[PDB]
């Protein structure tokens, strides 16, 4: 994984001092420093005709070097392309697939990716619409017993649990060609607006724990990536994954480095973390968690 502690992992108390020294504006300047880093990679597949329409946003391509390729294609319009990026996690290659909110014309691509990448957990940190603007397609059967066939992948909703700030949807993916079935858990976090931070870092971290627990549970029953998406799949997605990585490293090694995490993440899911507020949120969420956990 690109996410190794080195070379400047910080303890939680050093993180407190670091944030105190830099303050919000210093952290914002640090985010700008990240935004300016020489972008290593190309976006040719994203920009190819045929694939342009598969990008929700003209300004959010995905890197060639880390993209999730679709193998079992069908139909001229299904290229190997989905706007989806393999993302390392803490001590884990390809812990996530960061991807955009599926478009009607990429629903089937999305589920193909979920099938091919053996995904067990989908994390969605977007509503379908914000400001009456569609931000994500309704790419999964919303109501229990509802199903949608995406070619040879039939997705059936097995139940929806409505929690505080998120919804947990149990999906069956039935590969009807291979006669194979898999349960995928779909988590939709509802209180994290685009370009924003979650209303409560504690709610996000609890959600992170729920996601982790479900990933761990599903895996104990087979490591596949967790699909993490928002609308573009970069801002809230990068923030979610970065927080996850930092918290995981904090838990295991007592250290973290937000700047390293985000910088490295942006070499995999380009443009990860989309506002300085989200970048600052990573720090503040960690510090708030640290306080709540008596670590500081």
């Amino acid at each position: 994984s690109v996410h190794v502690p080195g070379p400047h992992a910080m303890t939680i108390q050093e993180l407190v001092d670091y944030v105190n020294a830099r303050q919000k504006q210093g952290i914002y300047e640090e985010y700008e420093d990240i935004r300016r880093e020489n972008p290593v990679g190309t976006f040719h597949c994203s920009m190819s005709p045929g694939n342009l329409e598969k990008n929700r946003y003209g300004d959010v391509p995905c890197l060639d070097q880390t993209r999730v390729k679709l193998t079992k294609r069908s139909g001229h319009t299904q290229t190997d392309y989905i706007n989806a990026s393999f993302m390392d996690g803490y001590k884990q290659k390809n812990a996530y697939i960061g991807t955009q909110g599926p478009l009607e014309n990429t629903y089937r691509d999305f589920w193909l990716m979920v099938w091919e990448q053996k995904v067990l957990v989908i994390v969605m940190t977007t509503r379908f619409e914000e400001g009456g603007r569609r931000k994500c397609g309704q790419y999964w059967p919303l109501e229990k017993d509802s199903r949608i066939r995406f070619g040879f992948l039939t997705v059936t909703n097995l139940g929806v649990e409505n929690m505080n700030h998120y919804k947990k949807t149990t999906l069956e993916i039935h590969n009807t060609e291979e006669r194979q079935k898999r349960q995928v858990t779909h988590f939709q976090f509802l209180s994290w607006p685009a370009y924003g931070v979650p209303s409560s870092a504690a709610s996000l971290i609890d959600f992170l724990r729920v996601v982790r627990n479900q990933q761990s549970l599903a895996v104990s029953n087979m490591e596949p990536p967790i699909v993490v998406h928002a609308s573009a799949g970069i801002g809230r997605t990068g923030t979610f994954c970065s927080l996850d990585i930092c918290l995981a490293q904090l838990e295991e090694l007592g250290t973290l480095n937000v700047f390293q995490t985000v910088s490295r993440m942006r070499t995999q899911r380009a443009f990860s973390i989309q506002t300085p507020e989200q970048y600052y949120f990573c720090y503040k969420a960690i510090l708030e968690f640290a306080e709540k956990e008596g670590m500081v």
Binding site: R56, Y57, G58, D59, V60, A194, S231, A232, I234, G235, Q274
Partner: peptide
């Protein structure tokens, strides 16, 4: 024409 980051 759909942009994620707009001013």
């Amino acid at each position: 024409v759909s942009l994620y980051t707009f001013d």
